[PDB]
Amino acid sequence: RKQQAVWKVKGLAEMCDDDDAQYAARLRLAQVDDNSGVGRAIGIDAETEEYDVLNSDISGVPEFLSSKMDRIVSLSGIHEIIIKNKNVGGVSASQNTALETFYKLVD
Amino acid sequence: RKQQAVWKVKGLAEMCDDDDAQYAARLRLAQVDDNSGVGRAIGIDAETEEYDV
Amino acid sequence: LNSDISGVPEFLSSKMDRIVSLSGIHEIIIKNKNVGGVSASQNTALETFYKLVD
Amino acid sequence: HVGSFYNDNATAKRIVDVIPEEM
Amino acid sequence: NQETLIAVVEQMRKLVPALRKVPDETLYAWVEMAELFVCQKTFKDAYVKALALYALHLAFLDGALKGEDEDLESYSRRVTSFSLSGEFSQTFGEVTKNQSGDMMLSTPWGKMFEQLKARRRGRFALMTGL
Amino acid sequence: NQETLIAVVEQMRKLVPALRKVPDETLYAWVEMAELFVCQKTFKDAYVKALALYALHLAFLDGALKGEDEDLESYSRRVTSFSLSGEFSQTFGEVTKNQSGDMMLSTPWGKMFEQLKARRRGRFALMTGL
Amino acid sequence: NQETLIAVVEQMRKLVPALRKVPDETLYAWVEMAELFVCQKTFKDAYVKALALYALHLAFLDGALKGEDEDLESYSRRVTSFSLSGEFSQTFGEVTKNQSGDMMLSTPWGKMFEQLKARRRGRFALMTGL
Amino acid sequence: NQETLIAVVEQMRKLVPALRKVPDETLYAWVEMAELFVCQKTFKDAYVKALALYALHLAFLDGALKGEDEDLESYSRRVTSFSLSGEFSQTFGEVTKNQSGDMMLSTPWGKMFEQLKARRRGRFALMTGL
Amino acid sequence: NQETLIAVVEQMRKLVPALRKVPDETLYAWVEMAELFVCQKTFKDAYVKALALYALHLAFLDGALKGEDEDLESYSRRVTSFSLSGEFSQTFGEVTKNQSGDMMLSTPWGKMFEQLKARRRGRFALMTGL
C-alpha cells in the first residue's frame, strides 16, 4: 500500500447492492484501472465526480529489519557470518580472522 | 502503526451495535481493505462519505 | 498527478538478502554477482562455500 | 512442542545443527 | 403485487388523515411510482411502512398531488397573498427553508425515510473493482 | 407487545395535555411508527419514556399530526397572517430556527431524546473490520 | 413508435390531472421532443415512466406550455401583482429558489428523474482512450 | 424515593412563584422525567437544588408545560401579534437569542445548572482504554 | 449561618432600592441559592458584598424574580409592544446586547463580581498532576 486512488461519484448510495448497476460500475472501474497509467488519461465528468491519488513513503524499513536480525544474531550465540550466510558485511580481511570467534566456540 | 486509513460515513451511530447491519458493514470494510492496494481503487459516494490516510 | 519511486531497489535487495540467508548458500553463488564487496584475492570470499561443500 | 518449530523454521534448524556437524 | 398496494394505501391514510377523500386510483398510481425507488431486500419487514413514507414524500415534494380542477398556470408559480376589497385578507409563505440543495430533506417524511434507511442498512457505498 | 402501547400513550398524555382528545388509534399508529427507530436494549429501563419522547418528536417534527378535516393544500405551505376586514387581525411565525441542518434538533423532545441517548449509551460508532 | 406515445401521454395525464383538457397534439409534440433526451437501454422497463417525467420537466421548466392566446410579451417577463381598484388584490411569486445554477433541479419531476437515473445507471462517465 | 419529590417540588415553587396553581401530579411527572438526567454522586448535598434547576429547565426549554386546554396547533408555531379591531393591539417576541446551537444555554436555569456542575465536578471526560 | 443572611439581604436592599417591598423569604431563598456558587476563602473580608453581588446577578439574569401573579406563559417569551386603541402606546426592548455567549457578562452586577474576583484571586487555573 504505497498509492491509493479514490474515486468519488455524486449519487452512489442509490444502488440495490446486488443488481446489474453495481456489476456494471465495478466492471467499468476494473477496466479503467487496468488500462490507465502513464501516457493514458481518464475522462472525468465535472460537477458530479472527482479523482484523487493518495501517496505514502517507505523510508527506513531495511534498517529496521537488519536491526531485528542483529538482535536474533546476538541472542542466538553464533557469529553473524554463519547465520546471515552473507560476507561483505565487513571489509575484506584475510580469512579466518572473522571466524576466530566461531572456531573458539567450536573448540 | 505507520499508516492508518480512517473511514467516515454520514449516518453510522444509528445502528443497534449488534444487529445484522453492523455485521454487514464490518464484513464490507474487511473485504474492501483486503482487496485494496496499488492498482486497485475504491468507489466513494460524495457528500456523504470520505476516506483519509 | 505525480508520484515518486524512492526506495524500491533497497527493498528488493533486502528481500533477496532474506532469501540468501534462509537458503543456506553464499550470496555470491545465488546472486551470481561479484563487486558486492571490495576486490579481494579470490577464494577468500568463497571459503565459507568451500567449507560447506567439504 | 519444539519439534514443529524445528521442522518449520530453517533458522532454528541451522542454529541447532551447525555446531555438532562442525565438531 | 396487489395486497401490498392496499396495505400501503391504508397505511398512508392512517398516518395522514384527509387523504381518504382522494380517489383510490391516484393513490395507486403514486404508490407504483414510488415503488421504483424503494428497495425491498434491505427494508425486509418494514417494506410497507417505507413505501408509504416514500409515497408521501413524493406526493408532497414541492406540491404535486394538486387536484382535478387546478389551473395549468399554478404548476410553475404560487400566490403569495390575496385579498377581496374590504372583506378579508390573507398571506402565504413557504413551510421550511432547507439550506442544503438536497432532495429528501425538504419534507418530514423524507427525513424519516432517510433515518430509517440509515438504521436498517446505512448511507454509504464502498466498492472495489471486479 | 400490547401493555407497552398503553404505557407509552399514557406517558405521552401525562407529559403533554390536550392530546387526550385525540382518538386512541392515531396515537397507537404513531407509536408503532416510532418503535421502528428506538432500541430498547441500550435504553433498558427507560424504554417507555424514550419511546414517548420519540413519538412526540415524530408527531411535532414539522407539523404531521394535523387533523381529520385539514385541507390537502396545507401540507406544503402555511398561512403567515390572516385578518377579517375591520374585526380582527393575527400574524404567525415559526417556533424556532435551527442553524444546523440536522433533524432531532428542531424540537425540544428531540433534544431531550438526544441527551438521554448520550447519557445512557453515547453518540459514536467506532468499528473495525471482521 | 405509436403505442408508446399513447402510453406516455396517458401516464402524464394520470400523474398530473387538469392536463386532460390540453389538446392531444401538443402533448404528442412535447413527447417527441422529450424522446430526444431520454435513453432506452439504461431505463429498460421504466422507459414509459422516465419519458413521462422528462416530458413533464420540459413542459414546466420555466413556463413553456402557456396557451393558445397568451400574449407574446409574457415570454420574457411575468406579472408580480395585479389589483382592480377597490375590488380585489393579488400578488404572485416564484415556486422555489435553486442555489445551484443547474437544470433538472428546478422542478420536482427533474429531481425524480435524476434520482431514477442514479438508481438505474448512475451519474458518472469514466472513460479511457481507444 | 418519595420525600425527595416533595422537597424538589417545594423548592421549585419557592424559586418560581405562580407555579403553585399547577396541579401537583404534573410537577411530579416532570420531576421524574428530570431525574433521569441528573446525577447524584457528583452533586451530593445539592441534589435537591440541582434537580429543581433541571426540572425548571426542562419545563421552560421551548415551551413545554403549556396547559390543559391549549390547542394542538400551537406546539409547532407561535402567534407573533394579535389585535382586535380598534380596541387594542399587542406584539410578541422571543426571550433571547443563543448564538451557539447548544441546549442548556437557552434558559437561565440551564446556565445555573451548567455552572453548578462546573463548580462541583467539571465539564470534561478524560479517558483511557481498559 | 444566620446573621450572614440578614447582612447580605440588608446590603442588597441598600445597593438597589425598591427591593424592600419584596417579601423577606424569597430574598433568603435566593441568597441561599447564590451561596452555592460563591467561595469564601478567596474573598475573605468582602464575603458579604460578593454574596450580595452574586445574588443580584442571579436575580436579574434574564428575568427570574418575576412576581406572585405573573402568568406562566411569560417565562419563555416577552411583550415587545402594547397599545390600547387611541389612548396610549408603548414599546419595549432589551437592555444590552452581549457579543460573547458568556454568562456573568449580561448584567452590571456580573461584571462587578468578575472584576472583584480578578482583583482578589484572579481568573485562571494552572494545575499539574498528582
Numbering used by the authors:
A (entry chain T): 215 to 321
B (entry chain S): 215 to 267
C (entry chain U): 268 to 321
D (entry chain T): 32 to 54
E (entry chain F), F (entry chain E), G (entry chain G), H (entry chain D), I (entry chain C): 2 to 131
Study authors write:
Siphophage T1 is representative of the T series of model Escherichia coli phages, which has been observed to infect not only sensitive strains of E. coli but also some strains of Shigella dysenteriae. Siphophages possess a long, flexible, and non-contractile tail that plays a crucial role in host recognition, cell envelope penetration, and DNA injection. Connected to the head through a connector complex, the tail of a siphophage consists of three main components: a tail tube, a tape measure protein (TMP), and a distal tip. Using cryo-EM, we resolved the three-dimensional (3D) structures of the icosahedral head, head–tail complex and the tail tip of a laboratory-adapted fiberless mature T1 at resolutions of 3.5 Å, 3.6 Å, and 4.3 Å, respectively.
The T1 connector complex is composed of two dodecamers (a portal and an adaptor) and two hexamers (a stopper and a tail terminator). The density maps enable us to build the atomic models for the MCP gp47 and CPs (gp48 and gp49), connector complex (portal gp52, adaptor gp45, stopper gp44, and tail terminator gp42), and TTP gp41. In addition, the entire head–tail structure of T1 is also conserved compared with the widespread lambda-like members.
